[PDB]
Structures are given as structure tokens and as C-alpha cells.
């Protein structure tokens, strides 16, 4: 079917210069190469944050400590205030 | 910030409260109390003490010895009548 065959061959061929052989695109005056594989190759990381979100920041946990390892001047005040709270108990 | 601790602060609490003072009063009040009416000294005599124990305790407690004392004045002053008039 020369209807079918010639329509389908032009259907394959006129984008075959756009996809198979990298001859840019004869009918399009803007180019096709510096849009998706060059400019928006950083597209999703122009859609997300670069260098913290996509590099993902393997970050060390900020180390919190115990109560500064001082169990004298605070525990005896706790025991005196506990005398006070038991006088309230 | 941590496990706080007033369950065990009883050791130096037990001075200031009000049942502590009553407790240290009445544990002293209870030991020297004689148990069951002991040492009442129910028998005594000093040539006038049986008069007291028979007459002037709270059991009898009657004023009739004063009557006898009045009778003693009837023994005395009437005899003083015999000495005077």
C-alpha cells in the first residue's frame, strides 16, 4: 500500500535525521542538542537543589552530650531541693 | 533533663515536721509509765498513816473524821470546860 508505505517512510525518515543521525533538525531553526542533553541535562537539578540535595550531604550528626559530667554541685542542690519538695510533699 | 530524685529524701526530712515532735515526745512519755498499777504502795504506816489510808483516800473520801475531829474538839474544849468553868 503506497499510501501506507510512503506515509510511514516519511513518518520514520523525517525524524530519522533528528534521532538516528545527529544532523540536528533541518526544519527547526532552533537547535535540539543544547536543550535536553546540555542545558536541561542539569534539568532535574535545576528543578531540585544542586550541591546539597543531589550531592545529598552525607553529614555527620552534631554530637550532643550528657550533663557536662558534673554530679556534685548539682546533685547536692537536687537533694536539698528534694528536701524542699518533700516538705511540700 | 535527667531522672530527678525525690523518693528517698526521707532520711533528713524526719526532723522538721509536726508528728516528729509529737513522736519524740511520746516515745519518751511511754517507757517510764508503770504498766498495770504497779508500785502503788498500798500498805504504809507511820503511826498516823493508817488513818489516812482508811479515811482520806479517794475511795472513802468522807468528811466524818472531821466529825471525829469535831468530836475531838468536843473531847478537847469541853474538857477545857472542865479545866476552866
Curated annotation (Swiss-Prot), chain A:
Compositionally biased spans, kind Acidic residues: 65-89
Taxonomy of the source species: Eukaryota, Fungi, Dikarya, Ascomycota, Saccharomycotina
Protein name: ATP synthase subunit H, mitochondrial
Miscellaneous comment: Present with 6140 molecules/cell in log phase SD medium.
Superkingdom in the source lineage: Eukaryota
Entry keywords, A to Z: ATP synthesis, CF(0), Hydrogen ion transport, Ion transport, Membrane, Mitochondrion, Mitochondrion inner membrane, Transit peptide, Transport
Annotated region (Disordered), positions in chain: 54-89
Main function: Mitochondrial membrane ATP synthase (F(1)F(0) ATP synthase or Complex V) produces ATP from ADP in the presence of a proton gradient across the membrane which is generated by electron transport complexes of the respiratory chain. F-type ATPases consist of two structural domains, F(1) - containing the extramembraneous catalytic core and F(0) - containing the membrane proton channel, linked together by a central stalk and a peripheral stalk. During catalysis, ATP synthesis in the catalytic domain of F(1) is coupled via a rotary mechanism of the central stalk subunits to proton translocation.
One Gene Ontology biological process: proton motive force-driven ATP synthesis
Quaternary data: F-type ATPases have 2 components, CF(1) - the catalytic core - and CF(0) - the membrane proton channel. In yeast, the dimeric form of ATP synthase consists of 17 polypeptides: alpha, beta, gamma, delta, epsilon, 4 (B), 5 (OSCP), 6 (A), 8, 9 (C), d, E (Tim11), f, g, h, i/j and k.
GO CC terms, sorted: mitochondrial inner membrane; mitochondrion; proton-transporting ATP synthase complex
Native source species: Saccharomyces cerevisiae (strain ATCC 204508 / S288c) (Baker's yeast)
Location in or out of the cell: Mitochondrion; Mitochondrion inner membrane
Similarity comment: Belongs to the ATPase h subunit family.
Keyword check for DNA-binding: no
From Swiss-Prot, chain B:
One Gene Ontology cellular component annotation held by this UniProt entry: mitochondrion
Major location (coarse): mitochondrion
Subcellular locations according to the entry: Mitochondrion; Mitochondrion inner membrane
Tree of life domain: Eukaryota
Keyword line: ATP synthesis, CF(0), Hydrogen ion transport, Ion transport, Membrane, Mitochondrion, Mitochondrion inner membrane, Transit peptide, Transport
GO BP annotation list: proton motive force-driven ATP synthesis; proton transmembrane transport
Subunit structure: F-type ATPases have 2 components, CF(1) - the catalytic core - and CF(0) - the membrane proton channel. In yeast, the dimeric form of ATP synthase consists of 17 polypeptides: alpha, beta, gamma, delta, epsilon, 4 (B), 5 (OSCP), 6 (A), 8, 9 (C), d, E (Tim11), f, g, h, i/j and k.
Miscellaneous comment as given in the Swiss-Prot or TrEMBL entry: Present with 14600 molecules/cell in log phase SD medium.
Physiological role: Mitochondrial membrane ATP synthase (F(1)F(0) ATP synthase or Complex V) produces ATP from ADP in the presence of a proton gradient across the membrane which is generated by electron transport complexes of the respiratory chain. F-type ATPases consist of two structural domains, F(1) - containing the extramembraneous catalytic core and F(0) - containing the membrane proton channel, linked together by a central stalk and a peripheral stalk. During catalysis, ATP synthesis in the catalytic domain of F(1) is coupled via a rotary mechanism of the central stalk subunits to proton translocation.
Protein family (similarity comment): Belongs to the ATPase F chain family.
Protein known as: ATP synthase subunit f, mitochondrial
Gene name linked to the record: ATP17
Residues included from the entire protein: 7 to 91 of 101
Amino acid at each position: 500500500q503506497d499510501l501506507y508505505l510512503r506515509e510511514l517512510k516519511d513518518t520514520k525518515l523525517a525524524p530519522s535525521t533528528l534521532q538516528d543521525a545527529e544532523g540536528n533538525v533541518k526544519p527547526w531553526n532552533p537547535p535540539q542538542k543544547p536543550n535536553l542533553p546540555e542545558l536541561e541535562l542539569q534539568g532535574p537539578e535545576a528543578l531540585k537543589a544542586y550541591t546539597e540535595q543531589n550531592v545529598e550531604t552525607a553529614h555527620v550528626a552534631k554530637e550532643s552530650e550528657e550533663g557536662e559530667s558534673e554530679p556534685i554541685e548539682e546533685d547536692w542542690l537536687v537533694l536539698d531541693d528534694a528536701e524542699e519538695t518533700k516538705e511540700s510533699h | 533533663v535527667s531522672t530527678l530524685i525525690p523518693p528517698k529524701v526521707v532520711s533528713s526530712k524526719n526532723i522538721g515536721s509536726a508528728p516528729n515532735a509529737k513522736r519524740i515526745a511520746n516515745v519518751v512519755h511511754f517507757y517510764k509509765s508503770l504498766p498495770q498499777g504497779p508500785a502503788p504502795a498500798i500498805k504504809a504506816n507511820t503511826r498516823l498513816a493508817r488513818y489516812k489510808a482508811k479515811y482520806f483516800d479517794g475511795d472513802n473520801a468522807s468528811g466524818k473524821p472531821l466529825w471525829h475531829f469535831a468530836l475531838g474538839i468536843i473531847a478537847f474544849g469541853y474538857s477545857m470546860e472542865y479545866y476552866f468553868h
